[PDB]
Amino acid sequence: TTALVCDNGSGLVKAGFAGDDAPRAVFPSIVGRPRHQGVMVGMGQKDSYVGDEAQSKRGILTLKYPIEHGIITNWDDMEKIWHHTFYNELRVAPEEHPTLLTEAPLNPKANREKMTQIMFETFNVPAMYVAIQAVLSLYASGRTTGIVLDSGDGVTHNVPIYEGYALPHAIMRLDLAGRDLTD
Amino acid sequence: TTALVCDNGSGLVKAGFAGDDAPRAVFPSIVGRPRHQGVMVGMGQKDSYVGDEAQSKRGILTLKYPIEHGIITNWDDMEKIWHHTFYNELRVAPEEHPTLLTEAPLNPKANREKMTQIMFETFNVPAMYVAIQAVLSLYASGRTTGIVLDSGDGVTHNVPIYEGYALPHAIMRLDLAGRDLTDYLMKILTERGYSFVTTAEREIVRDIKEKLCYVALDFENEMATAASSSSLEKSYELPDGQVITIGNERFRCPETLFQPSFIGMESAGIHETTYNSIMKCDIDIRKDLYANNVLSGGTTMYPGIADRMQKEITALAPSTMKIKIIAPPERKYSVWIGGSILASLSTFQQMWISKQEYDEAGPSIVHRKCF
Amino acid sequence: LKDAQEKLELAEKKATDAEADVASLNRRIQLVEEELDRAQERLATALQKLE
Amino acid sequence: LKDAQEKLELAEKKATDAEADVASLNRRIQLVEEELDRAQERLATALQKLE
Ligand SMILES: Nc1ncnc2c1ncn2[C@@H]1O[C@H](COP(=O)(O)OP(=O)(O)O)[C@@H](O)[C@H]1O
Ligand SMILES: Nc1ncnc2c1ncn2[C@@H]1O[C@H](COP(=O)(O)OP(=O)(O)O)[C@@H](O)[C@H]1O
Ligand SMILES: [Mg+2]
Ligand SMILES: [Mg+2]
C-alpha cells in the first residue's frame, strides 16, 4: 500500500500520500473553542473547530496553537488535530497506512516517545517512522551534501550534512522563527 | 399539547398558539377605571375595562398602561391583563399549556422573577420560559447572524448576534421608543392650536402619528420644502369632526429617533447606536453584521425609514463594506412569529422551566441554567 | 347595505391580492439582490486572482 | 356603512398603491436579473483570463 507522509510542523500541517509533488491538504494547526455564550438553539454548534474551519469562524473563537516551539505542549489538542487530518482532510483510515512524521532536531525525548505511543495506540497505524526535518529538505533539493537552514514557523535549525554523513556536533538550533516575527 | 406564545410588549399584547403565522388576539394593554360618578342603576357597570374594551369606552375612562419602559410598574394591573388574555381572548385555561413570555434585554431581575412567580402561583401553568425579545426577531427572519434593532413602543434595544453566539458586551439599550414619539408629537401639535391633554386623547395623537407621520430622507431639505410650498399638508378628521392639518409636524415627530436631542435626551440616534454596537464587536464579524442589519418592532414601520437608516450607516461605515437593511413587511409581529417558531422546535422542548424545578429552587430559577 | 356589502368584499379581495403580490415580489427582489451581491464577491475574487 | 365604505375605498386604494410598487419591484427584479446574467458572463471571462 501507500504511505502517509504527514508533517506536523508548527503553524501549517502538511500531509499527503507518498509519491506526489505537493501535499494534498494544507491547513493551519489551530484548535479554537468558542468563548461567548450562544443563544440560538439547534444551530449545531460544536465544542471545538480545528484546522481550516476555525480560520473562518475566528471572530468568536479563541484559537490556540498546540505546538509552541517544535515541542508539543497540549497533547489532547494535537491528538484532535491528527484525527482531523486523517479522517476529514484525507479520508483514509490509519489502520492501513504507514506514517512518516517529522521532528525538529534537538527536541525533548518525551515528545517523540509520546508521539509514537499515540500513533501506535490511538490511531493504530501499521508502522511509523520519525525523521529529522532538515534531511528531508536536503532530499528535495536532489543534493547529497550541503548545509540546510530550515527556518520554519516554530524553530529555526541549521543541520550541516556531507556525503550523507550528518555532523551531530554542528547542529545549531535557534528558537527565533515566524511566530516571533509575527509578535 | 400546544404552547402559548404570549408576548407582553408595551402598548400591544400579542398572543396565540405556537405554530401559526400570526397572533390570534392583538389588543392594547391598558386598564382604565371609570372616573365620573354614574347615575343609571343596573346598567352593569364594571370597575375596570381592560384590553380592547377600554378603547371603545375611553371617553369616560382614565387609561393607564401597566408597563412603562419594558419594566412593569403596576403588578396588579399586569395580572389583570394576563388573566384577560388567557380567559377571554384565547379561552384556554392555563393549567394545560406551557407559556413563553418575552422580556427586553438589561431589565431588572425582580421584574422577571415576579413574572415567573405569578405565572407559577396564580395562573398555575405547567412550565414557562422567558426569552429575549431580539433573538426571536432574528429567528423570524430565518437568519442565524445579524444585528437586530427592535424599536418597540417601550424601549429600543440593539442586540448583535453572530453564528448563534450572542455578544453580551455589545447590547445597546436606549429608552426612546414609540411612546416618547407620541408625547413629542402631542407637544408639537400645540404650535398650530390643537391641544390634546387627557389620557384618552393620547390615543388620538397616536392614531395621527401612525397614519400620517413619515421619516424624511434628508431633514434639512424637507424642512426647507415644507416652509415654502404646501404639498405636504395632509388633513385628518378627529373623532368628532373639525379636521386638522398637519404641516411639517409630519416628519419632525419621527425625526426624534435620529436626533434624541429633540426631547432632551443626550444619547445618539438609532442610526449611530447601531454603528457603535457593531464597532464593539470583534474585527472579523463586522462585515457580516454590516450586511445583515435587521429591523423589527412596531416603531420601525414609518414609511421611509429603511432608506434613511441605510444612508446614515453608509455615511458612518467604511466605504468598502456593503450595508443592507432587512425590513420584512411583517415587521410588527416579527417577535411573535419568531416566538412561535422557537416554541415549535423539538430541540427546545427540554428547556422549559418545569414546575417541580421551580418548587425546588424558588423563583430565582430563571437566572440559572434555564435562562 | 348590499351595495356596501359588495363594495366591502371587493375592496377586501383587492387588498389581499395586492398584499400577496407585493410580498412575493419583495421575496423576489431579495433573491435577485442576493444574486447581485454574491456575484460581486465572485468579481472581487477574480480581480484579486488576475492581479 | 358610510365609514366602512370609506375604509374599503381606502383599502382598495392601498391595494392599488401596493400594485404600483408591485410594478416597480417587477422592474427591479428584471433589471437585477439582467445584472445576474451579466455577472455570470463577466465572471466566466475573468476566470478564463485567470487561466
Ligand atoms: N509567502 C510568505 N512570505 C512570508 N512569510 C511566510 C510566507 N508563507 C509563510 N510564511 C511564514 O511561515 C510560516 C509557515 O511556515 P511553515 O514552513 O509552514 O512552518 P512549519 O515548518 O511548521 O511547516 C507562517 O507562519 C508565516 O509566518
Ligand atoms: N403602522 C405604524 N406606523 C407607525 N407607527 C406605528 C405603526 N404601528 C405601530 N406603531 C407604533 O408602534 C407601537 C406598537 O409597537 P409594538 O411593536 O406593538 O410594541 P411592543 O414591542 O410593546 O409590542 C405603537 O405604540 C405605535 O406608536
Ligand atoms: Mg518545517
Ligand atoms: Mg416588542
- The per-residue DSSP string of B10-72 comes to SS-EEE-BTTSSS-SEEE---EEEE-S----SSS---S-EEGGGGGTSGGGEEEE-SBSSSSB
**Closest Cα to atom 2, ligand 1: which residue?**
A178
Q: Put residue B80 in one of left, alpha, beta given phi > 0 → left and psi -120 to 50 → alpha.
A: alpha
CATH code of the region B4-137+333-360:
3.30.420.40
With the most atoms of ligand 1 within 8 angstroms of its CB, the residue from A26, A133, A153 to mutate is A153
CA atoms of A139 and B127, how far apart (whole Å): 69
A153 lines ligand 1 (CB under 6 A): yes
Q: Does domain A4-137 match CATH 3.40.1160.10?
A: no
Give residue for cell 455578544.
B167
Q: Which residues pair with A63 in a beta bridge?
A: A32
Q: How far is the CA of B328 from the centre of ligand 2 (A)?
A: 15
Of B159, B178, B176, B100, nearest to B336 (Cα)? B100
| Closest Cβ opposite residue C23 in set B322, B324, B329 | B329
Residue A29: φ, ψ to 5°: -100, 80
Regarding the domain with residue range B178-256, which homologous superfamily does it belong to in the CATH classification? Answer: ATPase, substrate binding domain, subdomain 4 (3.90.640.10)
Residues near ion ligand 3 (CB < 5 Å) are A 9, 152
DSSP state of A23: -
Which residues make beta-bridge pairs with A61? Answer: A34
**CB contact B163 to A (< 8 Å):** yes
Q: Which residues of D touch C19 (CB under 8 A)?
A: 15, 18
Q: Of C4, C10, C19, which has the smallest distance from its Cβ to D18's Cβ?
A: C19
Count the helices and strands in chain D (H runs, E runs).
1, 0
Residue A10 alpha carbon to ligand 1 centre in Å: 9
N residues, chain D: 51
* Inter-axis angle of helices B109-121 and B75-84, nearest 10: 50
Q: Three-state DSSP class for B154?
A: coil
Cα dihedral B61, B81, B181, B16 sign: negative
Per residue in B325-355, is it b (16+ CB within 10 Å) or e — as a string?
bbbbeebbbbbbbbbbbbbbeeebeeebbee
Closest CA to B171 of B150, B201, B198, B141: B150
Closest CA to B68 of B8, B117, B5: B8
Contact B329 C22 (CB under 8 A): yes
Dihedral sign of CA atoms D17, D21, D24, D26 in order: negative
- Nearest CA to B182 out of B306, B11, B7 is that of B11
Consecutive H or E run containing B173: strand B172-174
The residues with which B160 forms a beta bridge, in sequence order, are B147
CA distances from B168 to B55, B160, B182, B280 (A): 39, 8, 31, 11
C-alpha cell at B357: 424545578
Q: Which residues have a beta carbon within 5 Å of ligand 4, which is an ion?
A: B 9, 152, 335
**DSSP H helical segments within chain B, as ranges?**
75-84, 109-121, 133-140, 178-188, 201-212, 219-226, 249-252, 270-279, 286-291, 305-316, 334-343, 355-361
Whether D41 has its CB under 8 Å from any CB of chain C: the answer is no
Cβ atoms of B283 and B162 within 8 Å: the answer is no
Contacts with D35 from chain C: Cβ below 8 Å: 32, 35-36, 39
- Provide the number of CB pairs (under 8 Å) joining chain C to chain D: 95
Residue B24, C-alpha cell as written in the block: 390570534
Nearest-10 crossing angle of helices B305-316, B270-279: 50
Which residues are CB-neighbours of B87 under 8 A, at least 6 positions away?
A: B93
Question: Chain C contact for B36, CB < 8 A?
Answer: no
Task: Judge contact between A70 and A104, C-beta under 8 A.
Answer: yes
Of A182, A178, A181, the residue nearest A151 (C-alpha): A178
Pairwise CA distance, residues B354 & B366, whole Å: 11
Q: What angle do CA B288, B291, B294 make, to 5 degrees?
A: 105
Burial group, residue B357, by CB count within 10 angstroms (0-12, 13-18, 19+): middle
User: Beta strand pairing status for B325-326 and B293-296?
Assistant: parallel
Burial (Cβ within 10 Å: 0-12, 13-18, ≥19) of residue B161 = buried
Between helix A109-121 and helix A75-84 the angle, nearest 10°, is 50
Residue B320 three-state SS: coil
Across the beta sheet with B61-64, the strand order is: B49-50, B31-34, B61-64
Beta carbons of B53 and B31 less than 8 angstroms apart: no
Do the strands B13-15 and A172-174 form a parallel or antiparallel pair, or are they unpaired? Answer: unpaired
CB–CB contact A37 B132 (8 Å): no
| Among chain B residues, CA nearest to C23 | B329
CB B103 within 8 A of CB B131: yes
Q: What angle do CA B213, B336, B137 make, to 5 degrees?
A: 75
CB B72 within 8 Å of CB B23: no
Q: Helix %, strand %, coil % for chain D, to 5?
A: 95, 0, 5
* C-alpha to C-alpha distance for B164 and A156, rounded to whole angstroms: 41
Contacting partners of chain D (3+ CB pairs under 8 A): C
Burial of B155 (0-12, 13-18, 19+ CB in 10 A): buried
Experimental determination approach used: cryo-EM
In this structure, are residues B134 and B295 in contact, taking their beta carbons and an 8 Å threshold?
no
Contacts of B343 in chain A (CB under 8 A): none
Amino acid at position B265, single letter:
M
Contacts of A100 (CB under 8 A, 6+ apart): A3, A4, A5, A6, A18, A128, A129, A130, A131
On whether the CB atoms of residues B148 and B136 are closer than 8 A, the answer is: no
CA distance C14 to chain D (A): 6
Residues B328, C29: contact at Cβ < 8 Å?
no
The alpha carbon of B152 and the centre of ligand 4 are apart by a number of angstroms equal to 5
Tell me which residue of B104, B162, B156 sits closest to B138, measured CA to CA: B162
Dihedral, B131, B135, B139, B143 alpha carbons, nearest 10: -160
Contacts of D45 (CB under 8 A, 6+ apart): none
Contacting residues for D11 by C-beta, under 8 A, at least 6 apart: C11, C12, C14, C15
Q: For chain D, say whether C36 makes contact (Cβ under 8 Å).
A: yes
Residue B135: half-sphere exposure toward Cβ, Cα within 13 Å: 22
| Span from the CA of A9 to the centroid of ligand 3 (angstroms) | 5
How far is it, in rounded angstroms, from Cα B185 to Cα B202?
Answer: 10
Coil/strand/helix, residue B147: strand
Matching residue, cell 375612562: B61
Our separate counts of H helices and E strands in chain A read 4, 11
d(CA B115, CA B109): 10
| Ligand 1 atom at minimal distance to the Cα of residue A14 | 23
